[PDB]
Amino acid sequence: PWTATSGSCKGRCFELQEVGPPDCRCDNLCKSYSSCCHDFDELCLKTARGWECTKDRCGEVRNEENACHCSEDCLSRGDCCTNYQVVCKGESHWVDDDCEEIKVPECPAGFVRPPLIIFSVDGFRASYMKKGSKVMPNIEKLRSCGTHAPYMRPVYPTKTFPNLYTLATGLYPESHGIVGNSMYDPVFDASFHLRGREKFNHRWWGGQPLWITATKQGVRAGTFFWSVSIPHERRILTILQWLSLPDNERPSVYAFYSEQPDFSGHKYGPFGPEMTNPLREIDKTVGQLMDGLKQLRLHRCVNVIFVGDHGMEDVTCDRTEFLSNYLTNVDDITLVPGTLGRIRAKSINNSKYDPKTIIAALTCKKPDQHFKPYMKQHLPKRLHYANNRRIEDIHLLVDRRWHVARKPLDVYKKCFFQGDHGFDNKVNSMQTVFVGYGPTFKYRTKVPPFENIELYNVMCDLLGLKPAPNNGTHGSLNHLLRTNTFRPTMPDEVSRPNYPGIMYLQSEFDLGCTCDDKVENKLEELNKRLHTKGSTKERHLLYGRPAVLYRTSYDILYHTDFESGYSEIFLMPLWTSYTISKQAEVSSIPEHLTNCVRPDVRVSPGFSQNCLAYKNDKQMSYGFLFPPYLSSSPEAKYDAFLVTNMVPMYPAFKRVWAYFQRVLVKKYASERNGVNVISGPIFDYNYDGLRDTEDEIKQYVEGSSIPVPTHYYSIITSCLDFTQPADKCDGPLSVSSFILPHRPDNDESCNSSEDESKWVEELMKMHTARVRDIEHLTGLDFYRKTSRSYSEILTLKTYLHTYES
């Protein structure tokens, strides 16, 4: 691509509209494209006399060659050194001023809205805010005076370009398309890398990033990307100069980026003694910006976000696993290596390549194996890492502190490095930072940790923009904001339930089921009638019926111990809701009821499962959504064996489910002072994170229309103040949820030959989920009827229980 570098940057330095080749460029990215005009360094990257005013420069004659000015005309030109008022005019550094609440924007005449400045730092691990506090006074003041989270959760993989582009779009990497720092797109037949020019091609970058959302809605944006050779001081000066533009030309949104502390963290590890200086230098850059804003009378006008992309872990060349120690055929694969693995065939002409044999050769083969293979559809759903053709079918999830590589020579013909990142985004070392400071943010406010996919919505709220469709939950971060909150309405219910009564005689059913239940009292007869009409429903359905947000046919079924929403289309519940008090007792399935399945006289035979299909299907068994172990009485236990409570389960999966139901539910009720459980199936055969329609289901119980779930979920809710029982909670709630994969083996669990007490809870913790994850996968809307604010409930639905110490 040819450039006419003989043009000039005169009057165009850091121009905001980029110009078309062959014309030469003067914008903050021209260096990256080898396209700057011949005089860009001379005019636009001045360095003379450095970055600071000194007493002797005060009131100097302007010399246009100087990097920044200390002349009397510099404030009107907008090009003072950032410490000009401190050195020359007796002013204090911003960091030395007391924190004073910004109740309203205090903006210069002609400012239509508070500008937003995003100050992005690469590799800034969450714990640096505490561990580095003594050397980061400007950042500690933003943090203590503004709104801060103890940490912000990045997206997987915890790499730079996936995370920065998620910050910009509100999208998961599988949706925006930047699924790694390295990628092959088989449709394009094209490779994306950190080095080189392919990564500039727009076809890689999907969604709508914030600078485009702004520009389309009439809000002007600074260019967010900076060529690496532009010094940080010059990036700050360029932002301050843009903020001095005339009102009609001046952007409202800006970004600064620092390559530190990531650059040093790779060399020295996250807490290497060499890491103090990079933290001090980032802090000094924040101080330049804040002093510069104070000079422009913008320090009580601009909203500042201080945010990282990911953290940093200790990783050394010696902690590398080699695929050459597992695979015979190592020359027949291409590996994307490091802190994750992605595997595909080296040649699409090789008809000997078999993913199943590769997976099996990588599965629990060495006792302390430091990675686990997955077909991407079997990855924890909370990673949202499958629905992109750029994500290879075979994935390796690498243990924190480790790498994977194809063969040893890859590690020494490429130890050097002491830090790296990329691992599972629930890993503590990978967590990063969020601070918001300014008029629109709250004052001296802590907020709970949240995910970086939520920030795009908030940045849109700060700018008065309608966000493009994204994976945030708009409103979930309203508690960060003083004003500009977004006040969503609950989605409208699409399908109303049927409330069937007794409509069928037992002999109408030819389901091939049997139950030893022929055992016969007017006291207990009215009572069973009241329980079937919903007399215990306020105990077992604590937060209202889930709303069904798509068109379908389903029945509400009431029972003593549980309530369900029973799909006549999928022949099983969409949800089953029950409450277990701290005092509840566990019981056995009585010997005479081991194989008991009972026709439900409220549901037609034609909308029922049948036991014959399970008998004939030699791979598939069944379980129950409401656990028979937690029946309130022997009489109530018969309800748990209704055919309307049965769901298809592989034997291997029933090991996990029966341990959850028999041991773990009661443990959680004990620990949390009661729990409310909502359980159900999920169908996601196209791994898009969204509810399947019936025509997407790939597997049925043999000989039947009974669809097989890809996953089983549970939502486990209790009172945040555990001095109140789950069923009498006046205040905020506490939730944990999971999305367990419905697999025919426990190959994921290397210790599965051992007692469930040694592996099942570990599996469940890996498959922890947000309620929102379950909403996407089911088309249900939970917590419709609480005493809590809708924004509070949205925050609850985005909560992830991480199980990190």
Ligand SMILES: *[C@@H]1O[C@H](CO)[C@@H](O[C@@H]2O[C@H](CO)[C@@H](O[C@@H]3O[C@H](CO[C@H]4O[C@H](CO)[C@@H](O)[C@H](O[C@H]5O[C@H](CO)[C@@H](O)[C@H](O)[C@@H]5O[C@H]5O[C@H](CO)[C@@H](O)[C@H](O)[C@@H]5O)[C@@H]4O)[C@@H](O)[C@H](O[C@H]4O[C@H](CO)[C@@H](O)[C@H](O)[C@@H]4O[C@H]4O[C@H](CO)[C@@H](O)[C@H](O)[C@@H]4O)[C@@H]3O)[C@H](O)[C@H]2NC(C)=O)[C@H](O)[C@H]1NC(C)=O
């Ligand atoms: C996270 O939030 C995001 C954003 O909301 C959610 O993603 C949305 O999900 C929708 C459902 O999966 C999806 O809607 C589809 O849009 C199709 C048009 O798509 C283009 O236009 C939009 C708007 O500008 C654009 O954003 C799209 O961008 C994608 O594709 C480009 C490359 O083409 C990428 O650069 C970009 O990164 C992005 O890729 C991602 O999404 C695509 C799917 O669009 C994936 O395949 C990628 O892997 C990656 O994840 C596009 O440029 C529209 O055509 C669809 O409608 C079809 O389906 C319905 C089914 O009923 C049918 O009625 C229609 O007739 C049509 O069917 C016909 O085509 C079928 C497929 O060829 C065919 O099989 C049939 O037989 C028919 O011929 C559909 O509406 C929307 O695009 C995305 N948007 C984004 C940004 O990803 C996401 O779900 C959220 N995640 C969670 C878990 O909640």
Ligand SMILES: Cc1noc(-c2cnc(N[C@@H]3Cc4ccc(Cl)cc4C3)nc2)n1
């Ligand atoms: C070489 C090289 N490798 O990386 C970079 C680089 C990375 N990032 C930026 N700017 C970021 C992009 C972004 C996205 C979203 C938000 Cl909210 C803020 C920001 C600022 N500039 C350059 N140059």
Ligand SMILES: [Ca+2]
């Ligand atoms: Ca990074």
Ligand SMILES: [Ca+2]
């Ligand atoms: Ca799906």
Ligand SMILES: [K+]
């Ligand atoms: K069977």
Ligand code: NA
């Ligand atoms: Na196993």
Ligand SMILES: [Zn+2]
């Ligand atoms: Zn890095």
